[PDB]
Amino acid sequence: MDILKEKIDVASRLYNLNLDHIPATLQVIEHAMLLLKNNAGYGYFGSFNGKNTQEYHSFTFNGEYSRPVRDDLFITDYDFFVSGFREFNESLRDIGSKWSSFDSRRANKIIYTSVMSVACCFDLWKSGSRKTPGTFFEIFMAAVLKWMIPDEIFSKHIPLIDQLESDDESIDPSSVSTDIVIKSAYANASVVIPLKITTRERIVQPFAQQRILDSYFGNGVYFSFLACISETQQDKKKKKVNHICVPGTIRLYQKYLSSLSGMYYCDIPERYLERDLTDIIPVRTMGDFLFDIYSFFRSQGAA
């Protein structure tokens, strides 16, 4: 409960110190999962309604509700999740040769569960920076991306990215920038992975950053892939789920501000699945994310 924060802080500190943080981060997953399992109620909460219906569940504790959870996506069985996680782990070693839709669906479900397990724990036991789930999301992904392409350069900091993130934190201590830079060992090209659970008004931020990097380093050096969990919004009173989408804005951004290589969600909002977006920017999955990122580095750039 308060053991969870301590446990994150351990993994968070290892990460900043730039040490092997993966064991300590798995320990956070283990503990968040067992916490919800032994203390939290779990039921149907509300639905999103558009072209289709999407049902969402919530974890409960002493009245309080967690953010909405796609039950069809969250693995609510611990032993299931444990053996799932190991196979997910081994499939990343041979993603070059095999990456079926079953490999993608489970990578997606695993990432979702891992991040959302930590997130929901904070919604119920409200202890931490309130930006800690965002922090765990970065740490976790940094963990997985390391298992997968362990030969690419992780430990580079770029001055202008550090500038934007330092200044961001100096404004709002609760809204802090988590971006991952992976540079290719073999060519002068690298990816930049802005991580956010949900985007809200910070949707311009990856676009603006891409623009800045293009006009500072030149056009084919940095490629941005955006990783998210959802765009869900809880309406706690009416027991239903919104999807906060700005399709017009993203199109303006893609066309006239800057181009990103892709947008990725565990829980893709139904609105973002349409051609008005997908024509001009890939909107894929967190399982698709891993392959796309790997593919980029196999290609040595240019994707």
List residues binding its own copies (CB under 8 A): 160, 163-164, 166-168, 170-172, 175, 200-202, 204-205, 207-208, 211-212, 215-216, 244, 246, 248-249, 252-253, 256-257
Assign residue 182 a region (left: φ > 0; alpha: ψ between -120 and 50; beta: otherwise).
beta
Q: At what angle do helices 78-91 and 22-39 cross, to 10 degrees?
A: 160
Output the smallest distance, CB 188 to its own copies, in A. 19
Count Cβ atoms below 10 Å from residue 169 Cβ, excluding itself: 14
Q: How far is the CB of 235 from its own copies (least distance, A)?
A: 13
> Smallest gap, in angstroms, from Cβ of residue 48 to its own copies?
16
Min CB(179)–its own copies separation in Å: 15
Nearer to its own copies, 58 or 198 (CB): 198
**Closer residue to its own copies (CB): 175 or 295:** 175
Residue 82 or 252 with smaller CB distance to its own copies: 252
Minimal distance, residue 288 CB to its own copies, in Å: 26
Compute the least distance from the CB of residue 10 to its own copies, in Å: 30
Q: How far is CA 45 from CA 66, 161, 271, in A?
A: 10, 39, 21
Continuous H helices in the chain: 3-16, 22-39, 78-91, 101-125, 132-148, 159-171, 204-217, 247-252, 275-278, 286-298
Contact 171, 284 (CB under 8 A): no
Q: Among residues 49 and 166, whose Cβ is nearest to its own copies? A: 166
Q: Is 81 helix (H, G, I), strand (E, B) or coil?
A: helix
Residue closer to its own copies by CB (options 98, 238) is 238
Lookup: tokens for 22: 């993966």
Give the CA count within 13 Å in the CB-facing half-sphere of 214. 14
CB 170 → its own copies: shortest distance, Å? 7
Tell me the C-alpha distance between 288 and 294, whole Å.
10
By beta-carbon proximity to its own copies, the closer residue of 168 and 270 is: 168
- Asked if 226 and 263 count as a contact pair (C-beta separation under 8 A), the reply is yes
Owner of token pair 């293009």: 214
Shortest distance, position 34 Cβ to its own copies, whole Å: 35
The pair of structure tokens assigned to 47 is 């639905």
Q: Which is nearer to its own copies, 83 or 166 (CB)?
A: 166
DSSP state of 66: P
Choose between 72 and 162: whose C-beta lies nearer to its own copies: 162
